A paper describes a structure:
At Δt1 = 1 µs and Δt1 = 30 µs, difference densities on D1-Q165, YZ and D1-H190 decrease, indicating that they have moved to their original locations. In addition, a strong negative difference density appears on W7, suggesting that W7 is disordered during this period. The trajectories of the YZ area at Δt1 = 1 µs and Δt1 = 30 µs correspond to the re-reduction and re-protonation of YZ• to YZ, which completes by Δt1 = 200 µs, consistent with the 55–85-µs half-life of YZ•+ re-reduction by the OEC in the S1–S2 transition. At Δt1 = 1 µs, difference densities on Mn1–Mn3 and Ca vanish, whereas that on Mn4 continues. The results suggest that Mn4(III) of the OEC donates one electron to YZ• at Δt1 = 1 µs to Δt1 = 200 µs. As YZ and D1-Q165 move to a greater extent at Δt1 = 200 ns and Δt1 = 1 μs, the positive electron density on W22 increases and spreads to cover W21 and W22.
Photosystem II (PSII) produces dioxygen by extracting electrons and protons from water, which takes place at the oxygen-evolving complex (OEC), an oxo-bridged Mn4CaO5 cluster with a shape that resembles a distorted chair. In conjunction with the oxidation of the OEC, protons are released in a 1:0:1:2 stoichiometry for the S0–S1, S1–S2, S2–S3 and S3–(S4)–S0 transitions, and two water molecules are split to produce a dioxygen in the S3–(S4)–S0 transition, after which the OEC returns to its most reduced S0 state.
Author numbering:
A (entry chain E): 4 to 84
B (entry chain C): 23 to 473
C (entry chain D): 11 to 352
D (entry chain V): 1 to 137
E (entry chain F): 12 to 45
F (entry chain A): 11 to 344
The structure:
Amino acid sequence: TTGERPFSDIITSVRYWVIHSITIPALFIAGWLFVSTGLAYDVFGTPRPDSYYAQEQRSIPLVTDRFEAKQQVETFLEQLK
Amino acid sequence: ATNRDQESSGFAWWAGNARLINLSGKLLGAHVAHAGLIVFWAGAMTLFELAHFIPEKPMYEQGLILIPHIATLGWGVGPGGEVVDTFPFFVVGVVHLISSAVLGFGGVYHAIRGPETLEEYSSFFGYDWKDKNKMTTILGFHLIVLGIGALLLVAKAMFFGGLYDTWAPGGGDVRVITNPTLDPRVIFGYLLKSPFGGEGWIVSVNNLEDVVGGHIWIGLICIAGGIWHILTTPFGWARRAFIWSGEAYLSYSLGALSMMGFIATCFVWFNNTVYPSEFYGPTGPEASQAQAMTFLIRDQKLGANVGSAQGPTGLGKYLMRSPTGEIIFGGETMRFWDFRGPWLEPLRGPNGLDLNKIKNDIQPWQERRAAEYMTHAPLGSLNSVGGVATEINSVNFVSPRSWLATSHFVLAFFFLVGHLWHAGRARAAAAGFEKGIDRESEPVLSMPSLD
Amino acid sequence: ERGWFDILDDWLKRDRFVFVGWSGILLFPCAYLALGGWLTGTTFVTSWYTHGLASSYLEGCNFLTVAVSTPANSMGHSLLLLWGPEAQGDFTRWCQLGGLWTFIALHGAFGLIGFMLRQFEIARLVGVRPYNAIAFSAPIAVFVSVFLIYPLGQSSWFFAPSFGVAAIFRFLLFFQGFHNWTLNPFHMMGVAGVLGGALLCAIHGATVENTLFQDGEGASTFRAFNPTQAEETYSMVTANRFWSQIFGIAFSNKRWLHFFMLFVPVTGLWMSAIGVVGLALNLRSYDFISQEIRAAEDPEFETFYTKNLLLNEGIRAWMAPQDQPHENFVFPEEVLPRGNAL
Amino acid sequence: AELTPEVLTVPLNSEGKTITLTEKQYLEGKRLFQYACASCHVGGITKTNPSLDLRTETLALATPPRDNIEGLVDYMKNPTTYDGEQEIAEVHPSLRSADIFPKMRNLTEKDLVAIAGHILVEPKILGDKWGGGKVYY
Amino acid sequence: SYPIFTVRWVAVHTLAVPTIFFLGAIAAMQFIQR
Amino acid sequence: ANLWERFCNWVTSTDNRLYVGWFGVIMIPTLLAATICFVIAFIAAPPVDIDGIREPVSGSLLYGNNIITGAVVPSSNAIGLHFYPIWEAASLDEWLYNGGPYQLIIFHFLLGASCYMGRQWELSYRLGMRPWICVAYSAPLASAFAVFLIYPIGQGSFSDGMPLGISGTFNFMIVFQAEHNILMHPFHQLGVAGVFGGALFCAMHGSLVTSSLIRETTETESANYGYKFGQEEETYNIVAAHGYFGRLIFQYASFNNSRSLHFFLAAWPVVGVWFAALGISTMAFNLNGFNFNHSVIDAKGNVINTWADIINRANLGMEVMHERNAHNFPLDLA
Ligand code: CLA
Ligand code: CLA
Ligand code: CLA
Ligand code: CLA
Ligand code: CLA
Ligand code: HEC
Ligand SMILES: CC1=C(/C=C/C(C)=C/C=C/C(C)=C/C=C/C=C(C)/C=C/C=C(C)/C=C/C2=C(C)CCCC2(C)C)C(C)(C)CCC1
Ligand SMILES: CC1=C(/C=C/C(C)=C/C=C/C(C)=C/C=C/C=C(C)/C=C/C=C(C)/C=C/C2=C(C)CCCC2(C)C)C(C)(C)CCC1
Ligand SMILES: CC1=C(/C=C/C(C)=C/C=C/C(C)=C/C=C/C=C(C)/C=C/C=C(C)/C=C/C2=C(C)CCCC2(C)C)C(C)(C)CCC1
Ligand SMILES: [Cl-]
């Protein structure tokens, strides 16, 4: 053994479950809200179902320049009306 | 806790059911409880199928494997396989479900409440695996039961409404079987057919008279052999050839079941008589022939002479000759010319497909049937997207013939592995070295060197 | 001299549940970041602006179709640093431009270095020979040749493999269609090493388990072994006689046997890596010139070699427009290669 | 892009009257098309006769025209060949032949409109993919 | 007798804490409609 | 000591350099027949009309093949699943044209290899061994049945069995992908885990045992001379190996029981290859890999491509080109 408390000891202790009956659902709910508020879309820049295309276009907004790539994406994002 | 840990029994928990080998009373419970599970599933699955069943859709578009078994026996269906009454499906489900509680009850009682061993309690129900007389007697009882079971199918066919006959004149119908084939040259001649293409061994049975008469022969044979094995004990040649132990007897049955599972795989894949395509969908050969039929019909309506249309390879675009001369469908389906089905046979003459019948006698119901089977070919993805692997999502379909054939190949394969596992272990245990080599008696150390 | 360096060394090498070591300063951040980037990317990040693809659970992909995709072909071989001139510190743009791909590949490369330093470090403390580290050179040769050298020979990172299940399947099929990679003898050697390695794994395990000495009374033979016992737990002599009489030849030296088990899969992976280095430059084993000369002149000459090239030609024409959107391939129906009817 | 009333507006008849479907009608049309039609018509082609597809341009040149709601609803009651010369209820599913095509027995008039609407809207969404076959997959 | 905050404690939570958050995010995604 | 008992004692003798046994009585003639036919056909057989369209494919060395492109070509699609022994042909020239040799080779090989598995059981019994080495061999054996017998049955023709050649194997794999999307089937995925895992654990076990060899030699000699065949004592320190690998990961991720370690080495690749074999066997009945083609749709209903759709494009290219003259009707249903 290496000195740390055995895992079977910990996860059958009431105090472990007093603490983790709160921390585990709290993290789950934070993750749910990260999606349900729509925050995940805006942090990562991921399209919503209604923003892959403009209403009549069928061309991908593909990045084609290396050093103006940032402006190209911003321009593609404007053109969503 | 008799034999319920590794120290007392020698078997770890992951081989825990091996602790039951010499505990006939608990072993009886395990077997009865398990049969309840089988009967439970049959009852429950039928009810699930019925609840999800729409009579206007073909069975094969609905993921049904049990209702097609009931419909084939003549319950609930009329001409063309149309469902006329779903109540028999209901009855079959309910009765199996109710019976499973009886079996579950007895299983749980014998498993945890009743006597662990039966030998002290009753010498009729007691047994020793090494008692060759008692084992063949128990075997004999169960052969008589199986024989009655085969005779119940005959009773349904001859006296209680008949069977669904996909071949019946007028499109398929329930029909009472009045003259079952009894000629043993026919019945046993099926057993000596080659299993290769155009022959098909017993999978090729194609009429209900042979099906019913084969079950008459099987019924008598099982009853006779059952009486034989009650009254006799294994002969000397038999005694020397076998291992006589519980695990050995298990291993023989595992071999037998694996063989039966492989046969059932081919039965559902090729046979359209006892697995009517009305209920199960077309066979793979059937849907491929149906495509050729569909486009022959389309192109002939446009004015093509399909008899003389030369395809790109030089073989007929629509029709060609089999290696033995018969007129057959062309294209890649040349491999399927052994297919026989009621929608196709009216076009068949002595030389195979008959060009005059093709030109003049193709009825609209045949065009309908071929377009239906061509578009319900047994191809589809694991998530039940129907069609070739390159098809787009839209059609939720996998044929029952694919489900039944793949499941039973997998089961038969693992049961062959189980046979090898337990036959090899039974042999080693009988001879006494299934736990390893005795260091002081290592057989190879007493043998001359190879070189 | 017990300065701060030696005190730090003491703490790093404590016998704890997870050993750390000096190597752990490199290993743990880089491994954790590479794994966290893959999970972050496959959960939340799109491939819409680089590939025209959805690629995250957020977009509706499943475990088989999510990926962290390669950057757009227009990025070339850019490091795509978060603070570099393409993303310019903008985390959201960085994600949209494929910055997570180089993030994962580069932290992964340094993570792998760190894992192999860990094998050396622990081996030197415990006192064993470092053959586990040496065997691990083969996974490293594979990773570096496929994920780094191969795209560096090509036009851009875009043609590197993307980090996903179905994306890797696309990579296998691209290599068949464009490189005829099944024909490459360096791949063939790798196949032999992998399949022969699996074979050796199965046969050695089964042979040990079926030549065991009866060292206990239970029907479960696992208990009859003690890690400190001096005796072999199975009979090398009976094993040798069995395979000599079944197969003709057998192992008789147990040290050779286990060196060979190291040698076979490690050598195989190294061979496959060399072939991929050649594919970086399109230096393929694509054709047999003698077959092509004959088939060009003799329209009745047909082999499985010529049949497979027709399949490769189908792959290229039918997948290129979607798989290479920056090229803008417009292939009208009439130019697509197809057999009769299909 | 969104499924808008503009997308859901389709010709009702040959005289140029339009009708605007609801999203619920469109989605019901999709489900019923899958139920009764897609085994042969997945993606707007026709597996048992690939010469005839469900592209609006193809439907416009049918006789009588089928590129509008009334033409399509009539087709599902009494289908004809492309030139209108022959009635093909005996080999194509229809209300007239619901006895031999049992899936048509539980379609109501409202359903035929929704199926028709799906067939006319889908090309406005999918372009060439609708009726184009494997080339556009 | 035992400590609470060890290296193993840190290693466990750097993995387990984001896992639960991600599982909640992915659970929410199953109710997104197009 | 009558002549039958004498013959039985020789057949089952543990003193023959190669064990014969009752399985070997079937094994030896069938494997000899398959081997001799294979060698002759590979060198000298004329072209074979595999797909039944009078378009013969050249498989042998003398007809323009090298080692990589050569094959014994499957029998004709016109034969389908019919039995085609030499005596059903009007002549040897007919039999060769129609791929007769393929049937003779695989039927004798499958019989011989099944008897090879029985022979592994049989010798273990004669030597007092445990009996399950043959269960491990059932994994590669099941696979041979899958590509030579089961897949032909389900598709209805030995012309869709695997060719007996290097490039023929590749052809089989590519067409399999087009028709079943095998890459997306979990049983092939479990098979890849089986052989990638098996290769990994092979190198793992080899490296750990080699790392813990007990010093018994000088540096100028092979450490392999430190082990002597038949010696009673182990040749490496499994405690040192476990002490290294436990710290590499953590202590409870490491084996210290050689028996359960070696059982794991047996089980992992054997189970994985069983699934691979069952993948081929169940895709023989057209239960194909996952189909996510056009699974992701935007708010308007535009298809949003995934990597699955890119795989579909490659599959389509394989589909439309394979057997380019063999299809007259639009669906490749078998
Ligand atoms: C069909 C599957 C099946 C069946 C019928 C059995 C049956 C049995 N097992 Mg086995 N076993 C199985 C699967 C099965 N097992 C599996 C998957 C494993 C691996 C985990 C094992 C591992 C194992 C070990 C290690 C042992 C057994 C033992 C036994 C026997 C005694 C069990 C006991 O005393 O528990 C007592 C348990 C209880 C009293 C708790 C509840 C049990 C009841 C039966 C639950 C029934 C619930 C049901 C809904 C009630 C319906 C009532 C209604 C019909 C009226 C019994 C005959 C034991 C044995 O051999 O004894 C000699 C034994 O040691 N089994
Ligand atoms: C009628 C069939 C049958 C019967 C009565 C037996 C009976 C026995 N077997 Mg055998 N066996 C069989 C078929 C059978 N076997 C088959 C088909 C195989 C090939 C796979 C085997 C392979 C086998 C091996 C390798 C061993 C046995 C052993 C045994 C003995 C102990 C069994 C036990 O307690 O397992 C306990 C049950 C479990 C531990 C549960 C297993 C869980 C399975 C793998 C899950 C399967 C997944 C499921 C189908 C789907 C997923 C479910 C999930 C989604 C929830 C017992 C005498 C042992 C023995 O030799 O004793 C003498 C032994 O070592 N069997
Ligand atoms: C003979 C067995 C068998 C067959 C052929 C079928 C066939 C079918 N079922 Mg049924 N069913 C079965 C047994 C079977 N089922 C059992 C045992 C149950 C209770 C769990 C059910 C309960 C059930 C329900 C509730 C439903 C079905 C449905 C269906 C249909 C769709 C199947 C599907 O989409 O699967 C999806 C495919 C899988 C889930 C793949 C399973 C992979 C397994 C886990 C691998 C196991 C391998 C092996 C056994 C383990 C070996 C381990 C090794 C170590 C030895 C199809 C007709 C559906 C339907 O349409 O109803 C009308 C439906 O809703 N079935
Ligand atoms: C094959 C299954 C099977 C077998 C071999 C046995 C055997 C035994 N049982 Mg068990 N048992 C079973 C299933 C079985 N049982 C079931 C399903 C239940 C729940 C109903 C029970 C509930 C049970 C109890 C409560 C007791 C036993 C007892 C016994 C012992 C004495 C029985 C006797 O002498 O009856 C004499 C024979 C008869 C009375 C003839 C009965 C005929 C049946 C009821 C009519 C149907 C016959 C027909 C073949 C059924 C077809 C069923 C098929 C469709 C599935 C004997 C060892 C006794 C015991 O253990 O003593 C300590 C005891 O007290 N059993
Ligand atoms: C579950 C069914 C079953 C089982 C397990 C048994 C078991 C037994 N029977 Mg019984 N028997 C049965 C049903 C059964 N029988 C029936 C229904 C009848 C009436 C027909 C008989 C009539 C009977 C007689 C007359 C005798 C036995 C005997 C025996 C014992 C020796 C078995 C043997 O050596 O076979 C080995 C099989 C052979 C030796 C057959 C020849 C080998 C050929 C070449 C194998 C061919 C395999 C091939 C793959 C076949 C494929 C299908 C084929 C038809 C084309 C054994 C205890 C013997 C005994 O000891 O009686 C007390 C005996 O003399 N049985
Ligand atoms: C296969 C058994 C089919 C089913 C199910 C459905 N259709 Fe069909 N369709 C089929 C064929 C062979 C044809 C050509 C008929 C001919 O000879 O002209 C058609 C044609 C149509 C058309 C006409 C298309 C055109 O371009 O003119 C329409 C509008 C049509 N089919 C619609 C339709 C609907 C709504 C279905 C479900 C109720 C349906 N079809 C099913 C084959 C099959
Ligand atoms: C021994 C043992 C075991 C096993 C057990 C078993 C297996 C048992 C079985 C059991 C069973 C097998 C049971 C059953 C039961 C049943 C029931 C209980 C039923 C009921 C029914 C009902 C109630 C019905 C109803 C209805 C109707 C009538 C109508 C329709 C609708 C409905 C459905 C509602 C185990 C492994 C655990 C372990 C331990 C030992
Ligand atoms: C019902 C029906 C029918 C009929 C059927 C029949 C009549 C059957 C029979 C069957 C049979 C009649 C079978 C048999 C079988 C057998 C077997 C399967 C055997 C086996 C054997 C073995 C296994 C052996 C082994 C061995 C050896 C070889 C050596 C020595 C040792 C030993 C013993 C181990 C028909 C088709 C008409 C129709 C449909 C329905
Ligand atoms: C990128 C980046 C970063 C990082 C991040 C991170 C680090 C993250 C992490 C993350 C994580 C760390 C996550 C995780 C997740 C997890 C998950 C999501 C899981 C899931 C699972 C499952 C789902 C399971 C399943 C299963 C299996 C697998 C088998 C067994 C059974 C079961 C079924 C259970 C930073 C900020 C630095 C910077 C920027 C960039
Ligand atoms: Cl065709």
